[PDB]
Amino acid sequence: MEELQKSIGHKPEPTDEEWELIKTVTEAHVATNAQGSHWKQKRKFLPEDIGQKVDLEAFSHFTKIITPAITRVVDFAKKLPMFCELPCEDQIILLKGCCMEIMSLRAAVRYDPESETLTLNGEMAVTRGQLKNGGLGVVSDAIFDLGMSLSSFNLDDTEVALLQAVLLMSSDRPGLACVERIEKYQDSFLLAFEHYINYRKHHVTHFWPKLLMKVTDLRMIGACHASRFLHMKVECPTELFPPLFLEVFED
Ligand SMILES: Cc1cc(OCC(=O)O)cc(C)c1Cc1ccc(O)c(C(C)C)c1
């Protein structure tokens, strides 16, 4: 009864089914999402003399923690039954597709305006310049800009969880075989997501559509990291890249 409810002007909140789904995804996020309500005291600021060509000292610090952050993204998908309902091959294509998007979202929401830093793997707090010089180049700006911009959105774990699921179920991923099914899943997430937002009633105008634009920028970040990675594989040798990192980001 969606279109009609809208047209009148009712902002529909989550159904019982959608609430169930919401709790499934939220729990999944929070389990694979390093610490909470206290991620700040727990962060250790990277020595300012690191990351002032790829600065290999900085690159090295990032490559140590890049594997756990990646595995936590896979852990998140594992805890989603719809993800399980998919074939070996689609699952892998989906993970490779969304990995940098989710990691980057996760780094973005842990942006702190005071220190002007982001937190990686829940522990490591870096500045724009550090992350840029450590290999990300302009991908660092993109993540920092996103993080500053998201401050106003006041996301909760549930909103970040849903956003993650939407990223995960992207049927445009090349080589997929589950297009129709992956689209059914995403639509299902987007629908719970919007109802959750109606229920949350943020005092930001056009919240929903503004949120959707964030998704797009996260895809831009992913696509761009793909290109950065090519640049790195020339400004550093394969040797420096953790095996999982290579698994995920190179065809
Ligand atoms: C290391 C790292 C971890 C991360 O995850 C945070 C977490 O899952 O909470 C999120 C981001 C954006 C990064 C930074 C990063 C992400 C990708 C990448 O290729 C590089 C190279 C310089 C090694 C660094």
Author numbering: 201 to 252, 263 to 461
Copied sentences from the primary study:
The human (h) TR exists in two isoforms, hTRα (NR1A1), and hTRβ (NR1A2). hTRα is expressed at higher levels in heart and plays a major role in regulation of heart rate, whereas TRβ is the predominant isoform that is expressed in the liver and pituitary and is involved with hepatic cholesterol metabolism and regulation of metabolic rate. Thyroid receptor (TR) activation occurs when an agonist ligand such as TH or similar compounds binds to a hydrophobic pocket in the core of its ligand-binding domain (LBD). This causes conformational changes which allow DNA bound receptors to interact with coactivators, mediating transcription.
In hTRβ, Arg282 from helix 3, and Arg316 and Arg320 from helix 6 interact with the GC-1 oxyacetic acid carboxylate both directly and via water-mediated hydrogen bond interactions, as previously observed in a previous hTRβ/GC-1 structure. Asn331 forms a hydrogen bond with Arg282 that anchors the latter in place and permits it to form a stable interaction with the GC-1 carboxylate group. In hTRβ, Arg282 interacts, at the same time, with the carboxylate of the ligand and with the side chain of Asn331, which locks in place the productive conformation of the former residue. On the other hand, the productive conformation of Arg282 with GC-1 in hTRβ is very stable both in X-ray structure and in MD simulations, being locked in place by the strong interaction of the side-chain of Asn331.
